[PDB]
Design an enzyme around this catalytic site. Structure first.
Site, mmCIF file in Angstrom:
data_model
loop_
_atom_site.group_PDB
_atom_site.id
_atom_site.type_symbol
_atom_site.label_atom_id
_atom_site.label_comp_id
_atom_site.label_asym_id
_atom_site.label_seq_id
_atom_site.Cartn_x
_atom_site.Cartn_y
_atom_site.Cartn_z
ATOM 1 N N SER A 197 0.849 -1.191 0.000
ATOM 2 C CA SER A 197 0.000 0.000 0.000
ATOM 3 C C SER A 197 0.885 1.242 0.000
ATOM 4 O O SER A 197 1.653 1.465 0.954
ATOM 5 C CB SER A 197 -0.900 0.000 1.244
ATOM 6 O OG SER A 197 -0.085 0.024 2.407
ATOM 7 N N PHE A 198 0.756 2.069 -1.036
ATOM 8 C CA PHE A 198 1.423 3.389 -1.072
ATOM 9 C C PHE A 198 2.972 3.392 -1.033
ATOM 10 O O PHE A 198 3.595 4.305 -0.492
ATOM 11 C CB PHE A 198 0.906 4.231 0.094
ATOM 12 C CG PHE A 198 -0.600 4.222 0.236
ATOM 13 C CD1 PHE A 198 -1.395 4.747 -0.764
ATOM 14 C CD2 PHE A 198 -1.207 3.674 1.362
ATOM 15 C CE1 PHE A 198 -2.786 4.762 -0.639
ATOM 16 C CE2 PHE A 198 -2.600 3.671 1.482
ATOM 17 C CZ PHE A 198 -3.375 4.202 0.476
ATOM 18 N N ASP A 208 -7.416 -4.953 3.925
ATOM 19 C CA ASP A 208 -6.857 -5.449 2.650
ATOM 20 C C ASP A 208 -6.378 -6.898 2.770
ATOM 21 O O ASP A 208 -5.233 -7.260 2.524
ATOM 22 C CB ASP A 208 -5.729 -4.553 2.118
ATOM 23 C CG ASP A 208 -5.538 -4.728 0.596
ATOM 24 O OD1 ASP A 208 -6.407 -5.317 -0.096
ATOM 25 O OD2 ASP A 208 -4.498 -4.333 0.103
#
Ligand SMILES: Fc1cccc(-n2cnc3c(NCc4nc5ccc(F)c(F)c5[nH]4)nc(N4CCOCC4)nc32)c1
Ligand SMILES: Fc1cccc(-n2cnc3c(NCc4nc5ccc(F)c(F)c5[nH]4)nc(N4CCOCC4)nc32)c1
Lengths: 295, 295
Positions: B21-22, B130
């Site tokens: 993520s990111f 997630d």
């Protein structure tokens, strides 16, 4: 590191969509043209810049059926930039979409075009050297039925452009592509020639038939580890074992490719005809209707 | 953009191994410690930096079974940097290695630990948001039998740390994770709670059983397109249809998770017991022997 909205003044840079040999691939817009494109980026600080070389191979290949158009290549800031025609999804993407099951009909339709794309590259004096599902993309719109081949970053010349004299038989010194689809000769550290691209396509077709290959490995491994584990398995798995339960043409194809001499011109039409004969005995219709078109 | 050999003075940066993520994930070395690590990088120029927030969630989670240790987080040049304990392969990697076929025994062994990891996160006041195969990794060495959970970049608090007062029922305003494994409530734009993580795990288990999910889609699609196509299919596919041909426990699990109230404390032990009862009726041995251990 953040991407600006533009790469220089002419190109809108959109989202990263995947990778290629020695670079990342982005969606973008040619702002002056008002056209959507794909953009490959290479950091200029890389030890051995190659994007410019790759771009020249694209330019040489232009005009072939299923070769994307190259728009521009050059530098912008911290990147070398190569702007390409936008195409449809890769065959790996479409295989996933179809739950890793392709019908025999779709396999055969793909095989016919894929052999032709490879032949075209060879006609222009190069070996592709990274034949894999990710490097074949469908077209857009009215060309949605056309398979394109991409990525010339590992491509190498096998004959002189003027004399057509074949390169000598030799050990490989070039960087190599995916262990998974590599020819046996590639695993042995030998220079690739026309036969090797066709052998690798044979493994790709079997992957589409099976859903996997029996030498599948773990990503959490070094390239060295992958070559060694895959070499050992691929080398101990006969073609007749790999291809068991499938139409005999897949094994006939692979054995033909492995029996070519290093400098032989492959009989591409004979390889196509294997699959086309099967297609007609099956009663299939040559109608451009692939599995994903029924989704 | 090229990575130097080091991230500041303390960390050797090795190869990019994937994404989170990111941010991107790299192998590395803590040079002062003489220890191999994993390193997550976030470009400081990003619109909404979050790595520091994620790192604080890791610190809060420390001490849980199957939670990686956090070594350091801070800035270095153009990046925020988060240095983590190095682990073994992801469950997606191992699923591929096993040709996208996991035995019922391996599914059950994984399910037991995965439910426990999720429970642990919930015990610390967060929803993971997630849940997917890529976010579960096996350990190394003597912990090779232990499933770890990673990535807190989408994790959000569901109850107050002091009062344990549950958040109110509400519409979602947070960025979301993979459409593929998302709960139905997530598709409806509702805030996730404990039930949603468990529902998503149910889809993960069915993916391991089947090899695919029936709402599989095409990467060449926007997130918007993926949510819409997956929502429509997932919403029109009953649990009993999804789970046909598998032990009834998979459907019993999914129906239990979908029938939880937004603020219910799930009965984690009942969910574990479903699978453990099946394991013993099957005559399986609880011996830490997963499919990939026989490869
Ligand atoms: F660098 C080149 C050279 C020649 C042609 C191209 N080229 C020209 N059109 C494309 C193209 N279009 C299909 C596509 N659109 C997508 C959007 C999101 C997404 F997630 C995807 F998966 C996507 N796939 N895809 C790719 N890639 C597929 C991904 O892996 C890297 C290659 N290269 C292209 C790029
Ligand atoms: F950012 C974090 C936070 C917490 C833990 C970790 N973390 C701690 N150990 C790992 C780890 N080790 C296994 C691994 N080694 C490999 C080498 C090459 C390769 F190709 C791979 F596939 C690899 N997979 N893998 C990952 N990743 C898997 C890939 O996708 C991104 C995640 N994150 C890790 C990273």
């Amino acid at each position: 590191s953040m991407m600006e909205l533009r790469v220089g003044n002419r190109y809108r840079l959109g989202r990263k969509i995947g990778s290629g040999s020695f670079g990342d691939i982005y969606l973008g817009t040619d702002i002056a043209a008002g056209e959507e494109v794909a953009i490959k980026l290479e950091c200029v600080k890389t030890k051995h810049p190659q994007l410019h070389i790759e771009s020249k191979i694209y330019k040489m290949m232009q005009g072939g059926v299923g070769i994307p158009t190259i728009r521009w290549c050059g530098a912008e800031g911290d990147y070398n930039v190569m702007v390409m025609e936008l195409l449809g999804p890769s065959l790996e993407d479409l295989f996933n979409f179809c739950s890793r099951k392709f019908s025999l009909k779709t396999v055969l339709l793909l095989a016919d075009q894929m052999i032709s794309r490879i032949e075209y590259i060879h006609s222009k004096n190069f070996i592709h050297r990274d034949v894999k599902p990710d490097n074949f993309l469908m077209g857009l719109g009215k060309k949605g039925n056309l398979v394109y081949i991409i990525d010339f970053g590992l491509a190498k010349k096998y004959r002189d452009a003027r004399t057509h004299q074949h390169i000598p038989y030799r050990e490989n010194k070039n960087l190599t592509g995916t262990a998974r689809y590599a020819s046996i000769n590639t695993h042995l550290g030998i220079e690739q020639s026309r036969r090797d691209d066709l052998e690798s396509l044979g493994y790709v077709l079997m992957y589409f038939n099976l859903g996997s290959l029996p030498w599948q490995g773990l990503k959490a491994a070094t390239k060295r580890q992958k070559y060694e584990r895959i070499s050992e398995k691929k080398m101990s798995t006969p073609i007749e074992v790999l291809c068991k339960g499938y139409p005999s043409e897949f094994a006939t194809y692979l054995n033909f490719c492995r029996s070519l001499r290093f400098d032989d011109k492959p009989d591409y039409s004979y390889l196509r005809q294997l699959f086309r004969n099967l297609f007609h005995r099956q009663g299939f219709s040559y109608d451009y209707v692939f599995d994903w078109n029924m989704l």
